[PDB]
Amino acid sequence: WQEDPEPEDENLYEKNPDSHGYDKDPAVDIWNMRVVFFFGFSIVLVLGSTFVAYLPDYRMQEWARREAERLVKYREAHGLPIMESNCFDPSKIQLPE
Amino acid sequence: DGPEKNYERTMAILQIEAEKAELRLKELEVRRLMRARGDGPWFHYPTIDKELIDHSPKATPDN
Amino acid sequence: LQYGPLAYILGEKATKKMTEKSKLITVDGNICSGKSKLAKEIAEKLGLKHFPEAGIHYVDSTTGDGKPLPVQFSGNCSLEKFYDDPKSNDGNSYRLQAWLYASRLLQYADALEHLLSTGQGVVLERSIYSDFVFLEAMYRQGFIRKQCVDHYNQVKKVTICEYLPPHVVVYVDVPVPEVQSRIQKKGNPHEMKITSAYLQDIENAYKGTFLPEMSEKCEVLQYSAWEAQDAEKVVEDIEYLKYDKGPWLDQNDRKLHKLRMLVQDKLEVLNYTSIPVFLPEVTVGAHQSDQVFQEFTELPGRKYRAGYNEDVGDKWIWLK
Amino acid sequence: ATFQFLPDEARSLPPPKLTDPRLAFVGFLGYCSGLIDNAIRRRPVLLAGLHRQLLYITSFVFVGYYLLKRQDYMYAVRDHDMFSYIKSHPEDFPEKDKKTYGEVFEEFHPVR
Amino acid sequence: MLKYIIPTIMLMPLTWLSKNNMIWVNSTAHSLLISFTSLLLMNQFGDNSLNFSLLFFSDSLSTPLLILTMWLLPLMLMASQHHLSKENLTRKKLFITMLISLQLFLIMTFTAMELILFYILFEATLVPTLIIITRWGNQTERLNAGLYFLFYTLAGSLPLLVALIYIQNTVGSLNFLMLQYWVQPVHNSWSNVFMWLACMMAFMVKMPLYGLHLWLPKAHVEAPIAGSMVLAAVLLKLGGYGMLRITLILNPMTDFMAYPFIMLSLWGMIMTSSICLRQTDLKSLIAYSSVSHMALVIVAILIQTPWSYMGATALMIAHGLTSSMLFCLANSNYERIHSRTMILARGLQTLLPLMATWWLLASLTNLALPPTINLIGELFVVMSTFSWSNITIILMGVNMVITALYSLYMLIMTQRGKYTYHINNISPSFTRENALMSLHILPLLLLTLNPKIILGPLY
Amino acid sequence: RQWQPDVEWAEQYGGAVMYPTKETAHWKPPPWNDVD
Amino acid sequence: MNPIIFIIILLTIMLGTIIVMISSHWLLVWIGFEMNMLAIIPIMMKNHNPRATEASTKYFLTQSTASMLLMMAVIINLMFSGQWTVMKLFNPMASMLMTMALAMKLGMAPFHFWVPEVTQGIPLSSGLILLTWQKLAPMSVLYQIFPSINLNLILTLSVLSILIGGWGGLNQTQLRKIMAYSSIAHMGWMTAVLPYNPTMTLLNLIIYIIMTSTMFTMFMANSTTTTLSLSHTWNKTPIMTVLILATLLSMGGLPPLSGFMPKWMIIQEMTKNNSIILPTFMAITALLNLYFYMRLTYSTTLTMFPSTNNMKMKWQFPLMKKMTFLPTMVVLSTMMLPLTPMLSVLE
Amino acid sequence: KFYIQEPPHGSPNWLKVGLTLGTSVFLWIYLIKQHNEDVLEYKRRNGL
Amino acid sequence: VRDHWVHVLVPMGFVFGYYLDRKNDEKLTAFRNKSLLYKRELKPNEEVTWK
Ligand SMILES: CCCCCCCCCCCCCCCCCC(=O)OC[C@H](COP(=O)(O)OCCN)OC(=O)CCCCCCCCCCCCCCCCC
Ligand SMILES: CCCCCCCCCCCCO[C@@H]1O[C@H](CO)[C@@H](O[C@H]2O[C@H](CO)[C@@H](O)[C@H](O)[C@H]2O)[C@H](O)[C@H]1O
Ligand SMILES: CCCCCCCCCCCCO[C@@H]1O[C@H](CO)[C@@H](O[C@H]2O[C@H](CO)[C@@H](O)[C@H](O)[C@H]2O)[C@H](O)[C@H]1O
Ligand SMILES: Nc1nc2c(ncn2[C@@H]2O[C@H](COP(=O)(O)OP(=O)(O)OP(=O)(O)O)[C@@H](O)[C@H]2O)c(=O)[nH]1
Ligand SMILES: N=C(N)NC(=N)NCCc1ccc(I)c(Cl)c1
Ligand SMILES: [Mg+2]
């Protein structure tokens, strides 16, 4: 009835062959390209990857290996078992019945 | 944050949360007893005030 | 104070301002009947406010800066297109008539608001009481569908019932051939395409329906083209009317307060002129409605409520 | 008391700080009401009527301050009542003797 | 967590106070800075979780989900700005506001200690998500998709509300740290069967569990691209995250209550994978692919082993980036041909060479090519379900065959063969589109060099 | 463009009731101004 | 109506309610209801049309019948206790009559039939009083006599109201009928929790009053009484559609909006009393309400319905209705959940 | 004069602006004064 | 500059949030230097172990 016709689809490359696809305004289009590329790639992915690579012993995985070596060295030197079936000292436990 | 700050911050959090849990359980028990017995400040439904009663001699003697 | 119950309680009552000259007078007739001239003379002689006939852009003249708005904001209603293509498929004919009724409805409210607020009478050229003659003429020539007439009567039924009729109805009876001769003399290219049958239907609607009805509740004065030229005689007749009919005799401060509370609120006046009766001629789809509204908000001094538009020089916004 | 918003005993409690986070939220709600007031009346939302916007915040903060005081008083009264009842009925709230996990027996349910 | 909540809130005044043409530049730039700071949550210890305060805490489960959540906002903004170009400015800002408010609810949802606080924020995500679909969706059916999405979720969440409130009364707390220490075994009774169901069914509808999944394909077909990205990348994971937490207090009853849901998921994944081979709508195919992948997550969560919980966490992260990438790839075609039919435009490698490489990489992760985190997660789940029962290897194996078939079939049909003759508006890929694809795949493939940060608390 | 309700879609919500039945077939929308 | 008389009649309505809430004597409670009813009829009749006359007549008969039953309960109580104090009743038969009398006044199902019809037949401003202020007096009595109320009767009235209110609203296109059935459903939640925690009745009552007042005020601002009339608001006052959207979602109990708080707090109280089936049933049944709130949001805010040409004339004129307290009410209708613990002020 | 008719809010209602600022000022003075007296009475009752 | 002042909002939000996170730790010092695991004697000029 009284309805506007459906507009034809706009090709951003016609008015701006150098378009980055961000905006129809060339100056804004270029700025929006730079923030995405700089904050996305230069910062988050490059610095974030470097940050992740040098995390200080994520969840003390390295400490546990050093600690295990210390215990293995001590327990073998003294003729103790490397590891015991019982985690908790039976002298501190009181079974029923 | 260092591991000691987080560790002892966790203890402070646990103490508060543990204390709140105990108080929550008591309140349910206190409420149950007050409602069943009516011997506490809660569930104290009103009764007529005795200061509304007239104690003066009446027109007739038997009362 | 802005008018309301508080102002009413403090003495702002219609009867304290309305005199014996506080009359609403409407001038009616066929096309090219010289009613515009006679209406202008009655107002001057009687010291009443004159209201030109409400056209497509009447609302434009009462809001913003007063200048007419582009046609898209009027819905593309065109009186010129109506003469050239009265049966056009864009539904221009009824859309114009529905728009014109709303403009008259607004003007009648402006007129009543003026009369009740100042006590000065007003002179109108046609009104919402006589607007139907064009609708009947359009229908009888096949320019509009029957469903259009039904929509018009639905809107009229829930709007006209709120307002009092004119104190005086002045009808200027110019025979159709004389009008048909005056239209040609006036040299309007599109208007010259009118037909006598359309003009005859307009005349029949006045005499068949309008004049008999208004006589039941108004003082009706009739004149010919010659008798109409004598403005002093017409004004002499008006000043000697009795006023013993119609609902104006039942009015009092209480009822007029309620009437003034309505006519001052233009959105309440127009409330039912856009009832959701989906009729092709007057229905606008969402996308067109959306973008036309966005364009309207961009017009100078239209984004914000009047008084808060910096782009037109309003000041002290941070304290208003 | 009866039909008293803040009985006299409530003055023993510390007052809410004027920097209370809840009071700031109430002030924020008042600010939002100021903006919605401008919007429904088609005024410039941020700039219009700064005098009006100031009273929206002040009104909300003022009323919010006293509602916060009553709120804190009612919870203090709740705790005060509960502890007194526990004190007066030690038989219903015995201090049970707690055991350690080495002593308590819990069934093991293997996940395999 | 306030160092993330407040800056996220500040994105709203930033958007509304920006210059008219800088709304996309400003919101994208600053939401990337927030994403950058989210890596400070990697301060995870081997014994204790990172417990900030009485309200919020992070551990190895919520941290990767939080980083995915905050990384997805800038990606959703780049994805959306083209198809919203003709929208009026105020409505663009409202759209961005819905995305910002969704991130605010999500980062609070994943860090809440107390389970009712989790419930409320978990529920609050419904409102903006529904608004995005129904207001800014394209076609008529978006109104029905909103209703199915809303009422499927509420049919499950309302019983959860009753169960959680019941649990607090009995236990005295819903703080998750407390529940770790005060948890008591669930004994067999009909009362506990329904408590178990009330605790789980809400999360199952979110995953979604097979049989409760039909809302998901409707929502995706109808939602705008940003709606699909958040729906697939993060919103489905609320169900997984909820189940991972609440199973703590449902032992040992889970030992037998899981069986009907393991059968649905084990069989459901084969049926949904086979369904993907016959789908005609590209967005509907990807939606069914998500149901198949999330079926493994449900199984892994239900069998409760260290390897399966590590597999579940890795799959949730990997699926989020992959499925979001696939929707973006499908959308870029849609913004050219304005149809989701998979057979409409063919041979697109001939016309868009680089975009065909993004399709290839996305498909390879979807079929879980070693050593992608998609495979690591899937492999860990397959290892653990083998111990649960050796026979499951047959169902897992068949699914991996069918998954490769529809993943490549989608690639072959759209990218290879002969280009459709009459389609002549296939313009070259924009820098925005290429950057959008590479911001999915690059973080995904970089995680292969350091998988531990996505393996969750059981690592 | 994005689909928006047309006249047919709008008329679903313009009747006396939402779910017509044989018993309400004679019902009619009330007057616009509530006046009969 | 003369503006001075209208104010006096409004104050008499308020005074009748206040008398009920401050009286310790049953006769004065009954007098309060009589006074309140006397002054409410003129505002229902103030537009003088047959539908208004029918509504006032149906209202008069229902309220008059209820007030007779209330007096009968008062006299039975006097026979068996010899006193008039407003508190628990001292006879089970008196308690049933008083409970049924008050259910009739509140419009709870199955005494609900009058509420949709009376609300439809009176102006929006009168409907606002009917569905908000008029609940205060009966609820304040229920707050005081609940210890003697039969538990099975009150919960049956609550369940039926939630069911009837939910189902009735699905078939409505008139905005006043939708509000009426919304009211019936919400009275059900208020009375379900009354036996367990009367404070949550007050919380639900206050929040319900705020949201209902918000909706009625926004309907008045645009003079909308039908779904289709309301669907034009987008092309006149776009802001109003957003406020209507938020308020309706709040009335639907969706987190994190204020209308979640009363449903949430009521579920908590009944679970504490080992009542699990009833809260679960009520919450699920309340999805019926959420459905026909969502329908309104679809036609009002989330889609743009077709407009009319004459609407362009409305663009040129400002909104001049008072809309008193709307900015405050709408903010409280939607953004109060973070302040939920403040419900203890009602204790 | 841009407007064809004088707007209702062409010029600020100076009295109402004075009332608005006066009420805000009074409420802030009352609140701080109230808060200070609450603090002093709080310390007197607890002997701080 | 009036053109680029909006670019301090989010960074200031982060600083304020970082600030509020640290004050929140000051309300959780009930067990500072009191855990069995990390309890010790204060260093010669040390006022608290952490903050
Ligand atoms: C903080 C604790 C509490 C947490 C709970 C959540 C609280 C938030 C709810 C607050 C109450 C609702 C108030 C929202 C304010 C809305 C104002 C706004 O954003 O702008 C409205 C917009 C402006 O329209 P207008 O000003 O007339 O003209 C525009 C020309 N510039 O109008 C339009 O342009 C119409 C646009 C089309 C309609 C789009 C509808 C989708 C967007 C709806 C967003 C609001 C949804 C609220 C639900 C809660 C969200 C979490
Ligand atoms: C009593 C306490 C009140 C606290 C109030 C604190 C904030 C008050 C701000 C008052 C000044 C607002 O002033 C108003 O701001 C907005 C944006 O900032 C400007 O208008 C804006 O329009 C668009 C965005 O919509 C942009 O082009 C640009 O952001 C700006 O031009 C107006 O030109 C200015 O008049
Ligand atoms: C809508 C219908 C309205 C019809 C109203 C008809 C009038 C009703 C009159 C009720 C007055 C009598 O009410 C009834 O009296 C007897 C006499 O002790 C009471 O006594 C009876 O019930 C209790 C039960 O423990 C005990 O007192 C006793 O076992 C038994 O005799 C009833 O508990 C009371 O309910
Ligand atoms: N379709 C339609 N045309 C109208 C209406 N009112 C006026 N017109 C037309 O407006 C044109 C001019 O109006 P008139 O006043 O009647 O003619 P006029 O010559 O300008 O004025 P007078 O000669 O003084 O009477 C005529 O062609 C009318 O047909 C109306 O309600 N509907
Ligand atoms: N009848 C009920 N079950 N509810 C109820 N009001 N219980 C009274 C218990 C209570 C609860 C909160 C506070 I603060 C206070 Cl002072 C007292
Ligand atoms: Mg003329």
Domains of chain I, by residue range, sit at 2-51
H or E segment and range at residue E155: helix E142-171
Which chains reach chain C with 3 or more Cβ–Cβ distances below 8 angstroms? Answer: A, D, F, G, H
Question: Ligand 1 centre and the CA of C107: distance in Å?
Answer: 36
Task: Tell me how many helices (H) and strands (E) chain H has.
Answer: 1, 0
Residue nearest to atom 26 of ligand 2 (CA): E19
Q: What angle do CA E344, E347, E348 make, to 5 degrees?
A: 90
b/e sequence D15-40, b meaning 16+ C-beta within 10 Å: bbeeebebbebbbbbbbbbbbbbbbb
Cβ atoms of G234 and G303 within 8 Å: the answer is no
Question: Which chain A residue is nearest to residue F2, measuring alpha carbons?
Answer: A6
DSSP B62: -
| Structure-token match 């064009």, residue found | C134
In sequence order, what are the residues at sequence separation of 6 or more whose Cβ sits closer than 8 angstroms to the Cβ of residue E83?
E224, E225, E335
* Cα–Cα dist E316/E294, whole Å: 8
All residues of chain B having their beta carbon less than 8 Å from the beta carbon of residue G272 are 28
Q: Which of the other chains make 3 or more beta carbon contacts under 8 angstroms with chain B?
A: D, E, G, I
Please state the atom number of ligand 3 nearest to the C-alpha of residue G100. Answer: 1
Q: What is the largest CA-CA distance in chain B?
A: 89
User: Which residue is it, tokens 């006249």?
Assistant: F7
Q: If you measure from the C-alpha of residue C293 to the centroid of ligand 4, how many angstroms do you get, rounded to a whole number?
A: 29
Q: Which residues contact A62 (CB under 8 A, 6 or more apart)?
A: none
**C-alpha closest to that of A42 among E14, E38, E37, E32:** E32
| Cis status of the peptide bond prior to H7, with omega within 30 of 0 | no
Provide the token pair at G97: 């009559």
Q: How many CB pairs under 8 A join C and F?
A: 23
C136 lines ligand 4 (CB under 6 A): no
Residue H38 and residue D18: Cβ atoms within 8 Å?
no
In what helix (H) or strand (E) does residue D22 lie, and over which residues does it extend?
Answer: helix D21-40
Give contacts of C275 with chain F, Cβ < 8 Å.
32
Judged by its nearest atom, the ligand closest to the C-alpha of residue G211 is 1
Ligand 2 binding pocket (C-beta < 6 A) is: D 44, 46-47, 50, 53-54, 57; E 17, 19-20
Distance of CA G80 from the midpoint of ligand 1 (Å): 59
How far CA C190 is from CA of A82, C37, C78, C184, G158, in Å, comes to 110, 22, 11, 10, 71
Tokens of G324: 């008193």
Which of E3, E34, E53 faces I18 most closely, judged by CB atoms?
E3
Q: Using the structure block, give the residue that is written with the tokens 């069986």.
A: E259
- The residues, ordered by sequence, that sit 6+ positions from G237 with a Cβ below 8 Å of its Cβ are D40, G221, G222, G319
Between CA E254 and CA G211 the distance in angstroms is 43
Q: For chains A and C, tell me whether 3 or more CB atom pairs sit within 8 A of each other.
A: yes
Beta-strand relationship, E57-58 and E50-51: antiparallel
Token pair recorded at residue C319: 């304290």
Q: Is E50 helix (H, G, I), strand (E, B) or coil?
A: strand
Helix (H, G, I), strand (E, B) or coil at E407: helix
Nearest Cα to Cα of residue H19 among C319, D48, D43: C319
With contact defined as beta carbons under 8 Å apart, do G160 and G109 qualify? yes
Residues with CB in 5 Å of ion ligand 6: C 36
Q: Exposure string (b/e) for A57-86, b if CB count within 10 Å is 16 or more? A: ebbbeeeeeeeeeeeeeeeeeeeeeeeeee
Name the β-bridge partners of G154.
none
Residues 6+ apart with CB under 8 A from C168: C23, C24, C25, C26, C218, C219, C220, C221, C238, C241
Are C61 and C157 in contact, with CB atoms under 8 Å apart? no
**G330 inside 8 A of chain D by CB:** yes
Quick one: closest CA in F to A4, which residue? F1
Chains F and I touch (3+ CB pairs under 8 A): no
- Give resolution in angstroms: 2.3
Q: What are phi and psi of E173, to 5 degrees?
A: -155, 155
Q: Pick from C308, C312, C316: which is nearest to H2 by CB?
A: C312
Work out the burial of residue H9: count CB atoms within 10 Å of its CB; fewer than 13 is exposed, 13-18 middle, 19 or more buried.
Answer: buried
What are the structure tokens assigned to H16, written together?
């109402």
Neighbours, chain D (3 or more CB pairs < 8 A):
A, B, C, E, G, H
Nearest to D80 by CA among C204, C33, B41: B41
Do D109 and E305 lie within an 8 Å CB cutoff? no
